[model samples]
Target: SMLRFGIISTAKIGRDNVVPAIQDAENCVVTAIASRDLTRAREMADRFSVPHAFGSYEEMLASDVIDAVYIPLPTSQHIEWSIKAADAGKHVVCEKPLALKAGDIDAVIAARDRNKVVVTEAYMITYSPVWQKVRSLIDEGAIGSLRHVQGAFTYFNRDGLPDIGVYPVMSTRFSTGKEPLRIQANTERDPDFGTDIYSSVKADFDDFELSFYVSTQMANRQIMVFHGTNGYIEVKSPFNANRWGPEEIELADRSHNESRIFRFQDSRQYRREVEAFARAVENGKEEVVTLENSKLNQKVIDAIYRASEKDGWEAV
Candidate 1:
């Protein structure tokens, strides 16, 4: 059976890649398109050769033709529309960060339970083969007894003025009034429900001495480091490993030093995520990114925010 999918907006991603990927997937079909404006929605629908188009999300949700809705909306709007679609008996695939805090995730989970629907956060990296390799290397002792693990994610976004401070640690989205929150409350995160999700997860892994570094400096540096007693894998430039450097791995032992590079040539992380969601929705199988895992990751980010707030160390 073909999974009838609907695009929630004519966002750049929808127009450029996602919609086309769905069209190309083996058991998926683009059944409808919706946009804030009817004319634009009509144009997208016609251009994409979709059968139906709606100017309003409500209309699309009420339609009998759509099995699931793919939401690529702004960070603030993800949960509400996901709830709306799921409550209307449609499965939902949403972009990350799925919610700013754990409570908001709880609310989404509650909505899913009440409606008996599927809702997933679209963190495509976790669904790809690269992450699997990383996880397995650690599990198999490629890195001897986990001594320390550290990683950093950084980039520059000078054009974020309109939403300036929106994602800071102290923003409304992540402030809980529990301790001195990081970055102070920005307008985008609501203190009552949202949080600096990255910090929360950082705190969760505190006991393991895991240090996560996040920066928006645009220094043109991208790297991932996994350190253990005997080995380490350093991934350079996540998705585009082929351009800068191959996925680098090094192991140090009594005999000598050993190292090899795995070329992750043009991996389809986004496609893998969408395909996984489609399979989970259709077969009622377990999701690749389970709610439990999301909760843990969210916890770590929240804790990081807490630590930043108090100017102290917090352990999970």
Candidate 2:
């Protein structure tokens, strides 16, 4: 049987992305939709042909129809609802960062094990197979002894780090299979806006350095580069490749005259995420986005923010 997915929030992410992707997944079926407002829930359910609608998230969680729940709620509300879903014996997939801190994910992990259900943060890009090719290319020495990494994700008026930073941060781990030792953040803030307008963050890996910047107030840009002793590979539009342009990676030698760009099928990214989630639950295969994966990513972000606060690097 296909995995039955319940959407626990009326958040646009669910309506726009997850619902469509789940509909496309062979192993998945979105069975229920929930919102505090019954009308809103019904609207989304009807729009997606979701069979069931519930007025509250708990209503859906308590129902026997839903085997798993996707919580695309507001960041502050993610942890509680995720834990609650797990307590209800439903597999959980929550929004990125999962919680404000790494420790909160522990509670959800506790619930997951107690209930023997799957629980994961919706770390989409890492789950995509495009990264597996990148990872293998790096390991196969396609980029010749990888040395430094430089990346950027910028657009006008959006949260920088958590919103877009996760792309490049996860890319570093996906390709290298290692975590940074320490991190530092140099930020630029607008006096009136009083939020993180631009942040240049750096992470010191064991062998090489990865520097990436994320901006809420900058020209549109998204790119990741893996520089090595003999060559480099430029990953096209580090996030949402289908929405951006074509999925591409440019490989070139240090001579830097021209490069060969390999393009991939952009349509399968999210479908792969959904299929992998189902595979993890049904087959007990290794989960791509495990509790430990989310925790480490969260810990690195905490370290970055802490480094920004002290104006120095902090251990991860």
Candidate 3:
């Protein structure tokens, strides 16, 4: 039987991306949607052909029909609702960063163990087979002896979105199968807006260094480069590839002019992500984005913010 999903909000991320993706998954159905506003909840439900809608999130979580909950709420609210959903005996898939602090994810993990329900972070890129291939290629010595990683991701906005740092951090972690040892970061803030407008990070790994920059003041762009002794690998669109353009990887040998481009199928990573969560619910399979992975990622994020505060490096 397909897992029944109850979305916790009509947030744009849920309505525009994840809900549609869930509808496309094989062993999952969006059975209900809940919003603080009943009209908005019912409107989204009708638009997506969902069977039920509720004005309050608790109403949906308490229902017998939903087997799991997909939480696309703000980062501050993730821990609260995810723990509640786990206590309800429903599997949980919460949006990235999982929580603002690493320790907060521990609360969600505790609830998962107590309730014995699947709980995972929703990091869609990891579920994309193309990204898996990227990891495989790095492991296979396609780029022999990685020495350094450089990445830049930028968008124009003041509103909060995915913490931009996660993209480069996770990509580095996946390719090397190692966590950052420490991180040093600096930031430029928007005076009137009073939020970070730009950030540059330098993460020290055991074997290499990652230099990443994220900003909300420039033209939208994403780029990642893995440099090695033998060759260099470049990701044209490291984050949001399908939406940006065709997913592509260019491998360049010592001769910069000589390179090979690999293109992947045009697929929605969010759909694959939702399907993976459903499989975990139905087949007792492991989650693609494990709790430990989310914790480690959040730990690094914490380090980055901490570094910015003290204007120095912080151990991860």
Top candidate by lDDT? 3
**Order of the predicted models by lDDT, top scorer first:** 3, 2, 1
In candidate 2 the C-alpha lDDT for residue 23 amounts to: 91
Off by over 4 Å in 3: 159-162
If ranked by TM-score, best first, what sequence of candidates would result? Answer: 3, 2, 1
lDDT of 2 by residue, 15-87 (tens): 8788889998999999999998999999999988899999998889999999999988878898889988999
Model 1 misplaced regions, further than 4 Å: 160-207, 239-256
Residue pairs clashing in model 2 are none
Encode model 1's per-residue lDDT on 113-174: one tens digit a residue.
89987788766656656666666666677767655445544455432211112122111111
TM-score of structure candidate 3: 0.95
Model 3, residue 19: distance off in Å is 0.8
> What value does the lDDT take at residue 66 in candidate 1?
91
TM-score of each: 0.79, 0.95, 0.95
